[PDB]
Amino acid sequence: AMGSDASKVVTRGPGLSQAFVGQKNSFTVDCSKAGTNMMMVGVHGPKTPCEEVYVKHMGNRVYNVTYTVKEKGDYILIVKWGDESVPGSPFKVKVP
Amino acid sequence: AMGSDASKVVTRGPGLSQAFVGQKNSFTVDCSKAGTNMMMVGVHGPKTPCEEVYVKHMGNRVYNVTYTVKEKGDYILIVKWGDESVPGSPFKVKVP
């Protein structure tokens, strides 16, 4: 479809709610039903920034996202399709 | 500083204006003077999505961004600090 519809994006995985220092933290963002746009991911650390963010297209606008963190705390994960928040965003991520 | 100021983000590199199929395309996003927020990157392909997007923190909220593309065309690259476009965004990227 020509346009886009963020409400049709489906996001799931452990990295939506918890992340660990020293590990890869991941989730899937399925934009296959949402039209044509850019998927954007941001991780807000209140004190220390996110170290790596990696977004891999798996086909059909299904993406795997992996990210890493360096410090414990409560982070906020934002996933957008264009300028529009996908269902569930912002996500609260605990780094224990 | 507690808040944030997208207007202080400095973005530079070849990947802001051109990207090649089969290569890593890169630029630096220097957020060291912009306070505390998430840096978000999106690459809009009108026909075929961006394959990989990778954002690496280099220290002091200076980031290296690398991305890959699969199809020729004119792409749009968006760089945000929080929900605010950084100077220069949106960037027009030719994939020849």
Q: What structural keywords apply?
A:
four-stranded antiparallel beta sheet; 96 residues; Filamin-C (chains A, B); elongated; actin-binding protein; homodimer; immunoglobulin; mainly beta
Describe this structure in words.
- Two copies of one chain form a homodimer.
- Chain A is an all-beta fold and 96 residues long.
- The first copy, chain A, has one domain (1-96): Sandwich (Immunoglobulin-like), CATH 2.60.40.10.
- In chain A, 0% of the residues lie in helices and 46% in strands.
- The first copy, chain A, contains no helices and eight strands.
- In chain A, the strands form two sheets. A four-stranded antiparallel sheet of chain A has the order 1-2-5-4, with no helix packed on it. In chain A, strands 3, 6, 7 and 8 form a four-stranded antiparallel sheet that branches.
- In chain A, strand 6 and strand 7 form a beta hairpin.
- The interface between A and B is medium-sized, with 25 and 25 residues.
- Strand 4 of chain A pairs antiparallel with strand 4 of chain B, so a sheet runs across the interface.
- Chains A, B: Residues 4-96 are annotated as: Self-association site, tail.
